[PDB]
Structure formats: structure tokens, C-alpha cells
Amino acid sequence: SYCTLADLIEQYSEQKIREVSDRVNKPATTIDTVIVDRAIADADSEIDLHLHGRYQLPLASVPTALKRIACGLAYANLHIVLKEENPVYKTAEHLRKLLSGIANGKLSLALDADGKPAPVANTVQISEGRNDWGADW
Amino acid sequence: VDVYGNPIRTQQLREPQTSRLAGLAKEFAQHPAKGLTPAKLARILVEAEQGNLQAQAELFMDMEERDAHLFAEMSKRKRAILGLDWAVEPPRNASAAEKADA
Hints:
The structure is cut from a larger assembly and holds chains A and B.
Chain A: H1 5-21, H2 33-51, H3 64-77, H4 87-103
Chain B: H1 38-49, H2 53-66, H3 68-82, H4 96-101
Helix pairs in contact in B: 1-2
């Protein structure tokens, strides 16, 4: 859960979330929590797809850039039909580009609140090191 | 007296000098050759120059033990002496009493 309904409302205003989330009432009246939850879950799943090879999956903290990316992807997911030239689609593409840059080691995952994220041990591995005759015998 | 002229007292000959130093007999060598670097060797030699012969002696013992070529050379040199016949001779143009003493 890198973003919440509060984050979506704050980033896109409550009116737009209501309009793109209420599918049964015309005009919209309330925000459907289930739809928003599914959209946020899908955004988190995509982000994990991008970040699985460099960091641990169950992150204990959410970096701020991760919050922005999740909010953007979740909003893009709340559109049933999304054309290519829709600006929301372009924002989603830019965020996906940021994610790909992070995955390819060109961008670093920033601070969460004060501490660093938790990188995986992929680079750590070395055989073991056989150096007998060099132990001050 | 001795050759150097120091007075000799037969009272002190009953017991070894080091008998009253039971602490020495319980010591163990520190093996300063292990983990030895040129700086450490230079410090050991310089300190030995100043009166600290313990570290130098232990280092020499380790050096003798850990080098087969050096040990073989020293052993050969010493065994050369150990195999020589020896005799005690009286002084120049010695008298009968001196010959008997010899």
C-alpha cells in the first residue's frame, strides 16, 4: 500500500476521484472504496514487478517518490478507457519510465522518512575466498 | 678468586643463583616471528640494542626453528666442532707441579 485514498484525493482532488470511481450513479455521489483499493493494488503490483530485482518486496516503509508513482498509476488505472493522447496516459508513461530507470540502476530509491531502503543481496555473492598461507601462521 | 679478580665466596656455591627466581622457570616463549614484518623486525633489533634482549632471543629461536636451510647450516657448523678431539696442556715450560695439575 504505497498510496491511500487520502493521497489520491490530495493529488487529484476529491471531485475527480468521485467522478472516475462512481460507476453506478449518474451524476456521481460517493467514492467507491473497493474500486480505488483495486486500482492502488494494481499500481503496487506493477511497481513491485519493476522493483523486485533490486530491493526486498515487503517494504517496511514507502519512499515519497514511490508514493507519487503509485498515485499516478492508480489514477491511470481508474479509467476504463484510456486513449494514447490522454494526458493522464502520458503521466503514467513518464512514471513507468522513472520505474524502469530505477530498475536499470540509473536512479536510486530515495529516503523513506530518514533511513535508506533495503537493497537485496544480489551483488553481495562471492564464492568464499580460499587464502590459506596468509593467516599469520 | 676468579680470573677477573672478583672475590670468590664458597658459601654461595651451594645453591644456583636462579633458584630464588622461581618466576623465570614458569615463562613461555612469545614467538615473535609469527606475523613479522620488516618494520617489526627493525623495531625488535633497535630495542635489543637498548637492552631488551628477550624479544631478540625469542625471535632468534623462532628463526632457527622455522628455516630448514639456516638450521642445517648452523647444525653442520656446530657438529664440526663437536667432533674435534681435545686435550689439556700445561703452560709454557711448566714445572712438575704444574704438569701434575694439568
